[PDB]
Amino acid sequence: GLFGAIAGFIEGGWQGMVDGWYGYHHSNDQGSGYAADKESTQKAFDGITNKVNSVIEKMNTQFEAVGKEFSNLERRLENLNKKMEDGFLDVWTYNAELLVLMENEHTLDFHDSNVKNLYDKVRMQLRDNVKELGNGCFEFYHKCDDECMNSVKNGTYDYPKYEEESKLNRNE
């Protein structure tokens, strides 16, 4: 994928994450579990919804075939009519089939970007308070309880709060 996250450095998807497209699996003393990222899933949902309305609405004034008849002395006109209606049919077939191929490519890359962006958001917040394992996971240099995990997930992780504790653990 263009952004290198899906089927990339994050090797596989999570069957156990049922309530969204992107999210978290945490692991600490209290236990473990999956949780969807609400903000990024909804933003992706709004975009994709808009895309599927936009593709649909652009082909609302497509060419429509009208049934006409022609006599045996009107073969050139009949052929002209046939060429014209078939001509537009091929134009709109091409249009519909290409828009879909192109938008499918972009949709898959959009999702890939959203995962990568979510990873970078979490990474740029944790800094050197964690180890980056390279598989989409971060290992904490300080104990991160359930309320600490939720600050990571909702984007309010307090780096200065854990700086000194992490620094000590990482050094010794």
Binding site: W14, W21, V66, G67, L108, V115, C137
Partner: protein, 323 residues
């Protein structure tokens, strides 16, 4: 080993496939098929309004009043017209219909006629009006197109035949007339008495004349002769004038366009069923919310847009990646 948080993405048991530019046959978590591919196989009412089912009749057979088409002598408003590829019952007395395709095209914007008796038969007091043909036989007897009048000699006389109608109906009116081209002179004399005759039609804009043509032709329905029909759409308050020394096939009626709108003729061998639809095709009716369809290019009603495609599926979810 310490506490961990991991970033990841959804996977499910989906087997939905999509194509992209770089790669075909891609499994995705969610997908939206945008192509309707199915129909009910039935001809249906369109918004509660039944089509006009011509049966074995052609448009010409209907409007002329071919006696095999009598069920169509008075018809209600329609949503579309069903006609067979090769209807049996058209011109029972053989001939032609000038600008026939143009007439059929007019019908695609017409949803109802009122048939109006514009030239009552009883008013032809100087000519015989009872004439028919075994080509249009009814119950083993010579008959004729119901909407038309075959003017012939009376008392070995055919005086100049003149009829006139002012369109005061309130709408444009379809009127049809014909000229008889006989097989031979014996046919010319016994029907019309006069030789070297003409048929003349005139409105404010139309000026049309025919001289009949006596010629030996292959028998069609038993007849060497031919009837050549023409038509016009007479404007409101315009007058049509007929004039003939022989060979005129006069209308008795006119078809006032009583209802206008998007319509059409559908070519089909099938029959109307007790079903309702918003979109009809020659293969059957479509009932879908999908934007595209691949059923048939020729549709009537509020239809999806037609494409030749076998498949149109939009990825909505992400790539579905094995656990």
């Amino acid at each position: 080993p310490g506490d961990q948080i991991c970033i990841g993405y959804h996977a499910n048991n989906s087997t939905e496939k999509v194509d992209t530019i770089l790669e075909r046959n891609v499994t995705v978590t969610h997908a939206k098929d945008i192509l309707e591919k199915t129909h009910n196989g039935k001809l249906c009412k369109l918004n509660g309004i039944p089509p006009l089912e011509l049966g074995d009749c052609s448009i010409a057979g209907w409007l002329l009043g071919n006696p095999e088409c009598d069920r169509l002598l008075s018809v209600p408003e329609w949503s579309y017209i069903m006609e067979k590829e090769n209807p049996r019952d058209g011109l029972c007395y053989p001939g032609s219909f000038n600008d026939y395709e143009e007439l059929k095209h007019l019908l695609s914007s017409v949803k109802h006629f009122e048939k109006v008796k514009i030239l009552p038969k009883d008013r032809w007091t100087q000519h015989t009006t009872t004439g028919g043909s075994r080509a249009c036989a009814v119950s083993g007897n010579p008959s004729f197109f119901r909407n038309m009048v075959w003017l012939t000699e009376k008392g070995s006389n055919y005086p100049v035949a003149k009829g006139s109608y002012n369109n005061t109906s309130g709408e444009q009116m379809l009127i049809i007339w014909g000229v008889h081209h006989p097989n031979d002179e014996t046919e010319q004399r016994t029907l019309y008495q006069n030789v070297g005759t003409y048929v003349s039609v005139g409105t404010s804009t139309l000026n049309k004349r025919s001289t009949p043509e006596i010629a030996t032709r292959p028998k069609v329905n038993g007849q060497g002769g031919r009837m050549e029909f023409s038509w016009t759409l007479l404007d409101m308050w315009d007058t049509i004038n007929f004039e003939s020394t022989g060979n005129l096939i006069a209308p008795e009626y006119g078809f006032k366009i009583s209802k206008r709108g998007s319509s059409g003729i559908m070519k089909t061998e099938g029959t109307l069923e007790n079903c309702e639809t918003k979109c009809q095709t020659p293969l059957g009716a479509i009932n879908t919310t999908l934007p595209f369809h691949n059923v048939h290019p020729l549709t009537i009603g509020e239809c999806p847009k037609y494409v030749k495609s076998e498949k149109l599926v939009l990825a909505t979810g992400l790539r579905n990646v094995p656990q």
